[PDB]
Amino acid sequence: GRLIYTAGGYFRQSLSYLEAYNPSNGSWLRLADLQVPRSGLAGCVVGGLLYAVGGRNNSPDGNTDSSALDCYNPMTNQWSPCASMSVPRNRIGVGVIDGHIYAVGGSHGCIHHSSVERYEPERDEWHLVAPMLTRRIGVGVAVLNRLLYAVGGFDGTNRLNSAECYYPERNEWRMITPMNTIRSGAGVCVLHNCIYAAGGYDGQDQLNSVERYDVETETWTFVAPMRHHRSALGITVHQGKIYVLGGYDGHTFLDSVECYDPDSDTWSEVTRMTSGRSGVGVAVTMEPC
Numbered sequence: 177g178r179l180i181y182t183a184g185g186y187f188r189q190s191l192s193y194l195e196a197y198n199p200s201n202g203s204w205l206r207l208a209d210l211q212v213p214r215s216g217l218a219g220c221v222v223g224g225l226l227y228a229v230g231g232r233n234n235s236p237d238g239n240t241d242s243s244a245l246d247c248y249n250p251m252t253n254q255w256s257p258c259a260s261m262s263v264p265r266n267r268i269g270v271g272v273i274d275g276h277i278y279a280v281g282g283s284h285g286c287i288h289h290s291s292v293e294r295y296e297p298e299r300d301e302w303h304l305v306a307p308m309l310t311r312r313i314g315v316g317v318a319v320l321n322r323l324l325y326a327v328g329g330f331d332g333t334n335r336l337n338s339a340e341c342y343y344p345e346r347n348e349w350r351m352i353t354p355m356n357t358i359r360s361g362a363g364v365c366v367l368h369n370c371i372y373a374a375g376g377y378d379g380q381d382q383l384n385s386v387e388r389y390d391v392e393t394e395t396w397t398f399v400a401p402m403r404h405h406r407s408a409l410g411i412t413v414h415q416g417k418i419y420v421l422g423g424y425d426g427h428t429f430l431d432s433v434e435c436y437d438p439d440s441d442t443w444s445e446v447t448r449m450t451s452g453r454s455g456v457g458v459a460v461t462m463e464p465c
């Protein structure tokens with residue numbers, strides 16, 4: 177697309193911000209607020225429409241895990257509710273295959289989901305698919321070659337370095353090589369033929385390390401680390417470069433946005449969000465209006 181959208185997040189409470197960053201000129205635009213505040217959500221784009229999935233409204237008047245699917249139209253700058261998932265999913269992971277949205281894992285209270293469901297925009301309907309072999313919240317999700325990957329997270333007792341892959345035509349999950357680092361709440365995306373896992377929380381400290389999985393070789397290799405440690409970060413890809421937005425570094429809710437150029441293997445600070453926050457949903461699509 178053209179703009180990097182960030183939706184929701186957490187700072188003192190769950191947020192409703194929707195803001196769009198333009199890597200071409202460095203400008204931020206504040207757009208229509210989410211109907212419901214929510215942190216720990218995921219963002220994605222299908223057919224030029226932005227989607228906000230799952231999360232949790234941490235608020236003074238209580239805390240409510242979200243099963244909501246909400247759709248934003250850049251042309252109209254308006255949100256509309258879509259069909260809700262079968263179960264609330266806080267700290268969700270999302271991926272898109274063949275125009276379908278896969279919702280992966282997440283928590284509902286003290287329940288840690290292994291279940292997975294798929295949304296078909298043409299029918300505005302969710303359907304459960306095979307569950308993961310492992311319960312995962314704070315799970316990273318990415319799509320490569322029409323295969324879905326769930327990486328890391330937290331199963332209710334242990335934080336995970338494990339990862340698994342979903343084969344749609346077989347409706348089957350299979351474990352892949354584990355990461356070299358335990359990561360919960362990492363930013364997971366795809367660039368070229370590799371699944372990147374950036375940052376996260378390994379049980380003791382927030383991470384700045386970044387490793388990538390090559391599907392051909394089935395191995396994980398560390399690349400350059402990020403300038404700032406961070407968990408609960410937003411991540412996306414824009415014109416062959418990785419962007420990581422916000423997160424929590426153990427001391428502050430970051431406004432820092434870093435950019436990874438895989439050819440030079442370097443991270444640089446490219447902008448700051450209008451305010452620090454963690455647990456945002458991120459996606460890339462067209463320019464509003």
Ligand SMILES: O=C(O)c1cc(F)c(Cl)nc1Cl
Nearest residue numbers: 313314330360361377407408
């Ligand atoms: O285990 C954790 O401490 C953890 C950290 C995170 F940043 C997110 Cl998003 N989720 C979880 Cl579950």
